[PDB]
Design a protein around this ligand. Structure first.
Ligand SMILES: [Mg+2]
Ligand SMILES: [Mg+2]
Ligand SMILES: [Mg+2]
Ligand SMILES: [Mg+2]
Ligand SMILES: [Mg+2]
Ligand SMILES: [Mg+2]
Ligand SMILES: [Mg+2]
Ligand SMILES: [Mg+2]
Ligand SMILES: [Mg+2]
Ligand SMILES: [Mg+2]
Ligand SMILES: [Mg+2]
Ligand SMILES: [Mg+2]
Ligand SMILES: [Mg+2]
Ligand SMILES: [Mg+2]
Ligand SMILES: [Mg+2]
Ligand SMILES: [Mg+2]
Ligand SMILES: [Mg+2]
Ligand SMILES: [Mg+2]
Ligand SMILES: [Mg+2]
Ligand SMILES: [Mg+2]
Ligand SMILES: [Mg+2]
Ligand SMILES: [Mg+2]
Ligand SMILES: [Mg+2]
Ligand SMILES: [Mg+2]
Ligand SMILES: [Mg+2]
Ligand SMILES: [Mg+2]
Ligand SMILES: [Mg+2]
Ligand SMILES: [Mg+2]
Ligand SMILES: [Mg+2]
Ligand SMILES: [Mg+2]
Ligand SMILES: [Mg+2]
Ligand SMILES: [Mg+2]
Ligand SMILES: [Zn+2]
Lengths: 96, 74, 106, 55
RNA sequence: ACGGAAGGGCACCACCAGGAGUGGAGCCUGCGGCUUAAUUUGACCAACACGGGGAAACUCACCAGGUCCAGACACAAUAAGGAUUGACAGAUUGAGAGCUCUUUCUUGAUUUUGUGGGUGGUGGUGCAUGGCCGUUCUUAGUUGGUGGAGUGAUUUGUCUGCUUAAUUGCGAUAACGAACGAGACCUUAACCUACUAAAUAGGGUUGCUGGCACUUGCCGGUUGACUCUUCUUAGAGGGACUAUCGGUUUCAAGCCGAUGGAAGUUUGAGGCAAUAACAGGUCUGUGAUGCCCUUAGACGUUCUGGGCCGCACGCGCGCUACACUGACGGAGCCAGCGAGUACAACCUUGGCCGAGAGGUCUGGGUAAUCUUGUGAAACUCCGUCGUGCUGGGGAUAGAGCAUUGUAAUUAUUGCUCUUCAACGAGGAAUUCCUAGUAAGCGCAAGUCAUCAGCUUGCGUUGAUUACGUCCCUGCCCUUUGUACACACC
């Protein structure tokens, strides 16, 4: 993956924006949904995170369910150097 | 089952397009006006923005940010 | 002020029968509780879905064929009722599974 | 893999135009009602889906 | 287990009486064989219209080739005097591919090259495995708790008899009391002037009209009113349990007949379906998966083209015919299961066109509304043909016009015209079947862009012949014999 660096910031900031990604198996396709990049290097950057040990992967009907861990939140944070008081969206705790 | 045999090629070998690294490639873009001003060489592509230079091949210069759109003779 | 009549209609769908019958009876009983006129819970023909598959996953052996089916029922009900009463009725007591649809039919 | 060449062939229609949504197998697909599942993962998951043995 | 050993029973994947066929002919489809560069493969009652396998692309596995990395991670190596990417025009290329190159321009730490490692693989391995289903085996069989008999392999329990489709019971009993299988159960098709109701279903009265009669009449039309639920729907339900009676039964399980009913074959048909098993098969369904191989000129992936469709040949499901009960023209005009457009483009009404296929304009229908009452064939009536390979038969050949498809050539498919093959009811053999059944006839759905000769469901015309037996092929239980146990192969 010669993933362009600006699209790299884009994938990281979006994974910050919600914290959970889907990225259907379908290679070959022009545009990752709500991300505006080719799906293929999205898949490969995210699995690069998984191999580094900051994203857990789960497979279900060809849909790459991806979840972000605490040390992943860290790595993302100093990549964006956004202040440490703020968190991705998942940790917005809502009561029943 | 399936039984295979060693593949034999009809072309000797294809070599990768090794990138041509050039020593001090930027010396030929800009020149000094005898300890002073700076000057360009051979043309400047206007659409891309300042500082982008065209590619001479022969009797015509060629882009490479907007490579195919801009290829202007001279 | 929506006291005028709207000729509302309630469509139902359910892969089962018991909960569909309970829902229809409950709607009728609530309508009688508020004393509205109606056309009865007319039943719709059993829409049966049948698809057949080769029971073997590979394709050998004695030719075996299996049939998988559902049976859905609609049972639409039309009410000559005002606005907010029927809205409250249709937005309460919906047991899970039975899909309910409401149309003004204006 | 000049983008104009690689993967350029259209798959609007035909065998390979549809995947199983389960394994992606092109062979033996159930396109009725857009199940888009093959015969056999479908017989696996049908009792969970809502299909049942009646007759 | 086996016996061309005995006894008791069963099975139209056995027979009997028969019915319809195949094997004869042509064509399709699938294997084998051949050929080919590939004509990819797995199968050999339980392989061969099976892998939903109706492959022109994809499909895909094969063949010629052309591309790319989809090698994550960590280390090391180089590295902003550039690790490295891309690129017009040209040669090269099938390609308007910076595939490669000519020149140079562009991009920057993501890559590149070594390392361990990893990912993917319709690659090998179903004689390493799961799961799945096929088969033994659609038969009536199968264990375990004590208890007795044997030292034990084991046996009894599970059985002399009669009955049933059934290890189903009556019963007798070193056997007793329980479990799986069968049945029970579930769905469906039968009957409901009983209930609940119903413009997305039907009627009836009556409006308002059309006709033809003249008299109150009939056939109609009408999303006007009133009214009802037998007819169509779906809910609670009812109804059959062999009910009653007559025969026969150590008089008991039960069997036969008649009647009443709708139904008297378990009411019909299925759906589930036991222990043990198979070296049955599927790594070719999967991101089910062990091991092995590969993992960059790749067995990964993708693009173009060819192939899986070829041909001296055998075999199986098949379709249409060999004509008169027919062929062809006219005239009638009866169905049911389905299915149907959305984030995409289906069902198609109706109207204009074209002889046709087909085209066009518009409308409904996300569905008891619309397609559709799918006005379906076979069939019914009237005509032409009149025994002659004949108007039977429509394969094989040309010429055109259409639609699908990016792509119809190795004819996709439909229509027009012409050519008219073999075929005289088909050898030894062999297949399926007992009542809405065989067969004939279509219809719908699945495969689908386009296609069926296929399969799955449905309805229609709807029979001949039993209503039984081990003669053939097997199956079950018991007895007996064996030098068999990888078990008469
Ligand atoms: Mg018989
Ligand atoms: Mg036989
Ligand atoms: Mg006979
Ligand atoms: Mg025949
Ligand atoms: Mg023949
Ligand atoms: Mg058998
Ligand atoms: Mg085809
Ligand atoms: Mg091809
Ligand atoms: Mg190809
Ligand atoms: Mg090749
Ligand atoms: Mg694969
Ligand atoms: Mg393997
Ligand atoms: Mg004992
Ligand atoms: Mg015993
Ligand atoms: Mg049963
Ligand atoms: Mg009635
Ligand atoms: Mg009596
Ligand atoms: Mg039965
Ligand atoms: Mg069994
Ligand atoms: Mg084997
Ligand atoms: Mg095996
Ligand atoms: Mg491959
Ligand atoms: Mg073939
Ligand atoms: Mg022959
Ligand atoms: Mg067959
Ligand atoms: Mg003729
Ligand atoms: Mg009809
Ligand atoms: Mg002739
Ligand atoms: Mg016929
Ligand atoms: Mg088929
Ligand atoms: Mg021995
Ligand atoms: Mg011998
Ligand atoms: Zn430029």
């Amino acid at each position: 993956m010669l993933i362009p660096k600006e699209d790299r910031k884009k994938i990281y900031q979006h994974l910050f924006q919600e914290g959970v990604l889907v990225a259907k198996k379908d290679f070959n396709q022009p545009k990752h949904e709500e991300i505006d990049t080719k799906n293929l290097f999205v898949i490969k950057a995210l699995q690069s995170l998984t191999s580094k040990g900051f994203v857990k992967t789960q497979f279900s009907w060809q849909y790459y369910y991806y979840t972000l861990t605490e040390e992943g939140v860290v790595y993302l944070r100093e990549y964006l150097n956004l202040p440490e008081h703020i968190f991705p969206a998942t940790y917005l705790a809502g009561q029943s | 089952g399936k039984k295979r045999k060693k593949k034999v090629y009809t072309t000797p070998k294809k070599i990768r397009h090794k990138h041509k690294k050039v020593k001090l490639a930027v010396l030929n873009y800009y020149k000094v006006d005898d300890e002073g001003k700076v000057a360009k060489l051979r043309k400047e592509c206007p659409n891309c923005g300042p500082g982008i230079f065209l590619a001479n091949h022969g009797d015509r210069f060629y882009c490479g940010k907007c490579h195919s759109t801009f290829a202007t003779q001279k | 002020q929506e006291v005028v009549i709207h000729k509302i209609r309630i469509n139902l769908t359910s892969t089962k029968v018991k909960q569909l019958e309970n829902v229809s009876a409950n709607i009728i009983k609530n309508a009688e509780t508020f004393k509205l006129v109606k056309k009865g819970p007319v039943r719709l023909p059993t829409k049966v879905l049948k698809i057949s598959t080769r029971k073997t996953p590979n394709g050998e052996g004695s030719k075996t064929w299996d049939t998988y089916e559902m049976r859905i029922h609609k049972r639409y009900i039309d009410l000559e009722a005002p606005a907010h009463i029927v809205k409250r009725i249709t937005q309460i007591t919906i047991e899970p599974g039975v899909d309910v649809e409401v149309i003004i039919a204006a | 893999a000049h983008e104009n060449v690689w993967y350029s062939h259209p798959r609007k229609f035909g065998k390979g135009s549809r995947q199983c949504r389960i394994s992606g197998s092109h062979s033996g697909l159930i396109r009725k009602y857009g199940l888009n599942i093959d015969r056999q993962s479908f017989r696996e998951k049908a009792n969970d889906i809502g299909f049942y043995k009646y007759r």
